[PDB]
Design a protein around this ligand. Structure first.
Ligand SMILES: CC(C)Cn1c(=O)n(C)c(=O)c2c(-c3cncn3C)n(Cc3cccc4ccccc34)nc21
Ligand SMILES: CC(C)Cn1c(=O)n(C)c(=O)c2c(-c3cncn3C)n(Cc3cccc4ccccc34)nc21
Ligand SMILES: N[C@H](CCC(=O)O)C(=O)O
Ligand SMILES: N[C@H](CCC(=O)O)C(=O)O
Lengths: 255, 255
């Protein structure tokens, strides 16, 4: 199968990695709208229109399915993109809801959603979660995590001080934390260590990764299988510097 | 006189505040490309073209001069903008160079240039200072200041730790600090406080503010006298969050 993956930029790599490791696809066309990144700081009408525009980018590629790796575009643009697209478009929020259902039998478990401002203000996560019977849902816009991560602040005092800034106010101690942004997997264990260091817990909260969750959905929904070729064809495309993006793929993805 | 102000988003307000206090112009059309903010994290090509697209936006408005309030656009897009424009275009780098040339006779004074990644990478400031005979020039990309300032992290521990992270590796004690980004006046006193508090500085460093510097330039170059109408007509446009932009203008600029 030939598919598209769309993200606001390089962050989508966290999803593409899961897809690659699972060997789902013979061909993948990755588009990063990196001239306009971030999306998370911006308004719904702007982001919806970004998502429609990404649809036009894909048209000459004859993809059969579009993955929207971006949790912000997933939260805000996806309904509008699906409305004008014949092929299916799969976002990263719904697959995470299905993963939570499999992994979190206790409907009362405190679940913390972390995301960009736009993702958190949409309440996409909370709404889906409530519909499936969840009763203790909390949310937090950890906005500064995105540029810290862009600047490779993946440990140390500055990261620790930032986490502390966002997490100290929380009144509830989550048993489940949804990593509802492309960037946040890169600080997954530091978030785990934060809660383990700051509270007496025998195990860290369960972390939900958007990549692994969409992999599980794609396998099940499309009978996709971990035996697409050994050397998938993958093209990178960007509205900003595509050579830099390709250089990133080569360094971090081996491609 | 009707003129235009361009910036990547709201940060240009720091320049606009200075323009308004100086009563230089009867009417100002402000445009922020806030669908695509920030520019500072991006590349020459992408930023040159943003700045040519800003020319297009000003065409129906019949402006007589354009001020590029963005330090990043000034650094990367100015020449290209000027190459095509029929009206004078004034950016925020050259006026800062001439402000320094006026206040700082000592060619060995240690001047420190703070900007976005793109601004610093261009060496637009360093080149201009060197041509003016300056021999002691350091630069730092203080990239996380921008998002921290956007999230109103204007004091406290997170700012202090961010500043520590950028300022600690510095091998020269500055006598001149260029606030080479729209956003950095909002923490000017905090920056001055970090240097006075952690080092043995005899007296505060001379801080160069892009807006005060452009004003000085505009007055002198254009023989503008500060005798424009007491309440100028000012319009606010943006590529998104325009409503938000207009709110910010009323709350913060008195407009
Ligand atoms: C995302 C996984 C698949 C690969 N990866 C990584 O494991 N680390 C530890 C990085 O530091 C990194 C970076 C990186 C290079 N410079 C900064 N970093 C963080 N990239 C590229 C990248 C850049 C910016 C944001 C990103 C967000 C998500 C994924 C990759 C990102 N990919 C990176
Ligand atoms: C003319 C400027 C200096 C007036 N002004 C201000 O003095 N403070 C202290 C603000 O906090 C503020 C803000 C603000 C509203 N939300 C966060 N802040 C910081 N704006 C709008 C604004 C927003 C974001 C970044 C900005 C960067 C430069 C100038 C204005 C900016 N203007 C603001
Ligand atoms: N990809 C975005 C993060 C970067 C951005 O804000 O565009 C998300 O997953 O929410
Ligand atoms: N206005 C930009 C800062 C914000 C951005 O990165 O676009 C500058 O002065 O460099």
């Amino acid at each position: 199968m030939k598919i598209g993956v769309f993200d606001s930029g390089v962050g989508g790599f966290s999803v593409l990695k899961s897809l690659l490791k699972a060997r789902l696809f013979d061909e993948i066309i990755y588009y990063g709208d990196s001239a306009r990144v971030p999306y998370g700081t911006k308004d719904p009408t702007t982001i919806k229109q970004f998502g429609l525009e990404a649809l036009d980018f894909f048209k000459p590629h004859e993809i059969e399915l579009l993955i929207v790796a971006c949790n912000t575009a997933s939260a805000l643009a996806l309904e509008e993109m699906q409305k004008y697209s014949k092929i299916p478009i799969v976002g990263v929020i719904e697959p995470s809801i299905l993963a939570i259902k499999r992994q979190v039998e206790d409907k009362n478990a405190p679940i913390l959603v972390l995301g960009t401002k736009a993702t958190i203000q949409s309440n996409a996560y909370d709404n889906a979660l409530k519909q499936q019977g969840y009763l203790n849902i909390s949310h937090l816009a950890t906005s500064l995590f995105v540029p810290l991560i862009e600047e490779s602040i993946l440990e140390g005092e500055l990261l620790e001080t930032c986490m502390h800034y966002y997490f100290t106010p929380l009144e509830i101690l989550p048993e489940v934390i949804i990593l509802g942004c492309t960037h946040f997997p890169l600080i997954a264990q530091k978030i785990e260590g934060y809660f383990m260091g700051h509270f007496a817990l025998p195990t860290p909260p369960l972390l939900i990764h958007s990549g692994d969750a969409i992999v599980e959905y794609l396998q099940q929904k499309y009978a996709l299988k971990n035996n697409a070729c050994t050397f998938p064809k993958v093209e990178f495309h960007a509205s900003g510097d595509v050579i830099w993006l390709e250089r990133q793929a080569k360094e971090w993805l081996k491609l």
